[PDB]
């Protein structure tokens, strides 16, 4: 049996965080997405030569169900904490998401990555150095991605898988 990694996407609503996982799963030259099917959140991949399956939980749209976060988060082995580089509040919200992940998993060392997502051509308000400094204070990687070009998407997810393997 190939290893399966249960990944969870956490982050502010209203800033197109759903682009990260959509772009991972949908083939680099196909744009016809259906969230209703199983292949929409599962993907067999090869990372450092070892084949695995990535099962990704992204509850984009259910932010108001704030009391369901713990339930949703406990399903994950690894977390992608996502913010939009044009929205400072989504960047400031990361501290509490991480605190909540740590509380849910009952551990100070949970495999995690900080993802800065460029969702559109609106002005950047979060400088890469700020997010680079935040990620270093937590002891985690920082990956910056683009929703337009798919740049950084694989790297964000593969960096997480490596964090679970090296845990």
């Amino acid at each position: 049996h190939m290893t399966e990694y249960k990944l969870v996407v956490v982050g502010a609503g209203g800033v197109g965080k759903s682009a990260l996982t959509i772009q991972l799963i949908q083939n680099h030259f196909v744009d016809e997405y259906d969230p209703t099917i199983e292949d929409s959140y599962r993907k067999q991949v090869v990372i450092d030569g070892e084949t695995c399956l990535l099962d990704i939980l992204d509850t984009a749209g259910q932010e108001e169900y704030s009391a369901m976060r713990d339930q949703y988060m406990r399903t994950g082995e690894g977390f992608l904490c996502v913010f939009a580089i044009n929205n400072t509040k989504s960047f400031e919200d990361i501290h509490q998401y991480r605190e909540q992940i740590k509380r849910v998993k009952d551990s100070d060392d949970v495999p995690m990555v900080l993802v800065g997502n460029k969702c559109d051509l609106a002005a950047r308000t979060v400088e890469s150095r700020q997010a680079q400094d935040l990620a270093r204070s937590y002891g985690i990687p920082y990956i910056e991605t683009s929703a337009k070009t798919r740049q950084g998407v694989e790297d964000a997810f593969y960096t997480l898988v490596r964090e679970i393997r090296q845990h």
Partner: protein, 453 residues
């Protein structure tokens, strides 16, 4: 084939091509009509009022989802333009009977369906309604008269704005004694019935205008999605209230009674097909403050543990069992709304607004159809109500619950977690004892009704 006017005098005469309209491989399952994948607004409005056949499903879909690609004011202009058909004898007599009358009749069906099922466009723009009444006034004809009257009757109406249910169950609290109402004093069956009635009405009040365009996630969500948000906030409130009841019951025996009673409320929610209610309870149980209470869940009877595991299992593997179970039941039910929200958002964000064919932009209608399929499913569960009697005092008690008080989210959830660590310290701290807070008996009356129906 019919001779139609020039595109210079009538835009909708332009013929179909790979540059202005495309279709899916399949046909409407019950109607044998082709499925439009994409097209220009002109071609979409042509097919919305097509002369060859009536296309009710496409009208339904279009009127639910058009605002993402066309403004209400622009749609009215385009349908008035469609109705004003110029002529291009036997050729004219056939044209008037096989093109003008059907098209004009289909335009009026659009108008009728618009004022009937999406009147909010008219409530939100009084000039849109001024123009609709003006257009409908200019319509003359014997064939038209009947439909022109119907529309006018809908507009004015819109401008004006079973058998015996089961007996209400009582436990320690008696009728009218609202001051004694609490989790353990009210009958667990009645808590579940009254919460199911609130949650059902909250579910039924959500309209597609609050969902199309993912408007509940945007800056104006409070303006555009007020019923959805009230519904989610009730759910959140009840989850938090359940957690509060648990962790504020410091005595282990009393806390076991509290958790056990909530599992009974869950059992009744399962009986009633209130999946929102089910997941409110499951969410509370899997919360950080409740999940860690090992000494409490140890003393819970095996039958209640099993009830709780089956409920928890509905959410596993991306709601696989929940999705199967909802499909297997018939109304009345209270679906969990969160899945629909995620599916609409991802459908809208994960697909392009426009498709390009030979360098020409075509509106992606198939994206809109997929969203209208989710809104149709939401609506299929909103038609049937529950045959349960409202108890106005129990109802008012659940509507007025406010576990958070004036505290902010972080403040309150940390208070719940610190309460959890107090009542059941983290190992190797020994388990302390705490005094009882309930002066009434902890024994449940059970989930089977007290008297016969």
């Amino acid at each position: 084939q019919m001779r139609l006017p020039s595109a210079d005098v009538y835009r909708f005469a332009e013929p179909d091509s790979e540059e202005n309209i495309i279709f899916e491989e399949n046909m409407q399952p019950k109607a044998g009509i082709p499925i439009i994948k994409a097209g220009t607004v002109i071609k979409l409005i042509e097919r919305l009022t097509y002369h060859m056949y009536a296309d009710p499903n496409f009208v339904r879909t279009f009127l639910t989802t058009y605002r993402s690609f066309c403004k209400p004011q622009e749609l009215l202009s385009l349908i008035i333009e469609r109705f004003e058909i110029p002529e291009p004898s036997a050729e004219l007599k056939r044209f008037r009977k096989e093109y003008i009358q059907p098209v004009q009749l289909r335009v009026l069906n659009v108008c009728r369906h618009w004022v009937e099922h999406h009147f909010y466009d008219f409530e939100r723009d009084a000039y849109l309604l001024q123009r609709m009444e003006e257009f409908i006034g200019t319509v003359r004809g014997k064939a038209m008269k009947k439909w022109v009257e119907s529309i006018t009757k809908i507009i004015q109406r819109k401008k004006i704005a079973q058998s015996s249910p089961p007996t209400v169950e009582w436990h320690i609290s008696r009728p009218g004694h609202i001051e004694t109402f609490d989790l353990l004093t009210l009958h667990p069956i009645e808590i579940a019935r009254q919460l199911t009635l609130l949650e059902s009405d909250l579910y039924r009040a959500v309209q597609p205008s609050e969902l199309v365009g993912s408007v509940w996630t945007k800056e104006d969500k409070e303006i555009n999605s007020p019923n959805l948000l009230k519904m989610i906030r009730h759910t959140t409130n009840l989850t938090l209230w359940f957690e509060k009841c648990i962790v504020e019951t410091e005595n282990l025996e009393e806390r076991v009674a509290v958790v056990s009673r909530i599992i009974e409320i869950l059992q009744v929610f399962q009986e009633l097909n209130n999946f929102n209610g089910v997941l409110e309870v499951v969410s509370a149980m899997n919360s950080s403050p409740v999940y860690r209470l090992d000494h409490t869940f140890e003393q819970i009877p095996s039958r209640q543990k099993k009830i709780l595991e089956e409920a928890h299992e509905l959410s596993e593997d991306h709601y696989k069992k929940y999705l199967a179970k909802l499909r297997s039941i018939n109304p009345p039910c209270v679906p969990f709304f969160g899945i629909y929200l995620t599916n609409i958002l991802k459908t809208e964000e994960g697909n392009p607004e426009v498709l390009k064919r030979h360098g020409k932009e075509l509106i992606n209608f198939s994206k809109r159809r997929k969203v209208a399929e989710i809104t149709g499913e939401i609506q299929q569960y909103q038609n049937q109500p529950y045959c349960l009697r409202v108890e106005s005092d129990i109802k008012r008690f659940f509507e007025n619950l406010n576990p958070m008080g004036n505290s902010m989210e972080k403040e309150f959830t940390d208070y719940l977690f610190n309460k959890s660590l107090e009542i059941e310290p983290r190992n190797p701290k020994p388990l302390p004892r705490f005094p009882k807070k309930y002066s009434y008996p902890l024994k449940s009356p059970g989930v089977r009704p007290s008297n016969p129906r």
